[PDB]
Amino acid sequence: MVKAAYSSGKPAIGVGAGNTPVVIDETADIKRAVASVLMSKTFDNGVICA
Amino acid sequence: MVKAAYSSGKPAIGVGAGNTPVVIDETADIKRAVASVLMSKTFDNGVICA
């Protein structure tokens, strides 16, 4: 519906969300990264914006 | 063409002009008002924006 709001000839701003990626390289801590991802993703079954 | 620029599904801002009115009441100077209007209107035959 944000494309429906855009193509209506009126002023419109849309609050959306994109697919947010996470990059883990080789020189990072491994335990805290997995702990952080598992902590943030299960929050309210992952219906938070972005 | 500003309506053509608006209805294209892209970000767009338009530099336009409206009909600009002048209100002259009874408690004004009369000579300087007419002098100002005739001075500003004949500038470049009145093709200035607004």
Swiss-Prot record, chains A, B:
The active site is at C49. Induction: Expression is about 10-fold higher during anaerobic than during aerobic growth. Contains two transcriptional start sites, which are both functional. Both start sites are NarL repressible in the presence of nitrate and activated by RpoS. Fis is required only for transcriptional initiation from the upstream start site. Fnr can regulate expression from the downstream transcriptional start site only in the physical absence of the upstream region. However, under all experimental conditions tested, only the upstream start site is active and acts as a silencer of downstream transcription. NAD(+) 1 binds at G16. Disruption phenotype: Deletion mutant cannot grow aerobically in minimal media, is extremely sensitive to oxidative stress and shows morphologic defects that are associated with deficient septum formation. In addition, mutant displays increased levels of internal peroxides and increased protein carbonyl content. Both acetaldehyde dehydrogenase and alcohol dehydrogenase activities are thermolabile in temperature-sensitive mutants. Has previously been proposed to have pyruvate formate-lyase (PFL) deactivase activity and to catalyze the quenching of the PFL radical in an Fe(2+), NAD and CoA dependent reaction. However, it was shown later that AdhE does not catalyze the deactivation of active PFL. Inactivation of PFL is attributed to the CoA and Fe(II) present, which appear to increase the rate of deactivation. Under fermentative conditions, catalyzes the sequential NADH-dependent reduction of acetyl-CoA to acetaldehyde and then to ethanol. Under aerobic conditions, despite the reversibility of the two NADH-coupled reactions, wild-type E.coli cannot grow on ethanol as the sole carbon and energy source due to the down-regulation of adhE transcription and the inactivation of the enzyme by metal-catalyzed oxidation (MCO). Nevertheless, in the presence of oxygen, AdhE may act as a hydrogen peroxide scavenger and have a protective role against oxidative stress. Forms long filaments, called spirosomes. Forms rod-like ultrastructures composed of 20-60 identical subunits. Two monomers form a dimer in a head-to-head arm-crossing fashion through the ALDH domains. Subsequently, two dimers form one helical pitch via the interaction of ADH domains in a tail-to-tail manner. These units are further assembled into spirosomes. Formation of these spirosomes is required for activity. Can be isolated in vitro in a wide range of oligomeric states. Contains an N-terminal aldehyde dehydrogenase (ALDH) domain and a C-terminal iron-dependent alcohol dehydrogenase (ADH) domain, interconnected by a short linker. ALDH and ADH activities are topologically separated in the compact spirosome architecture. In the N-terminal section; belongs to the aldehyde dehydrogenase family. This is Bifunctional aldehyde-alcohol dehydrogenase AdhE. It comes from Escherichia coli (strain K12). The gene is adhE.
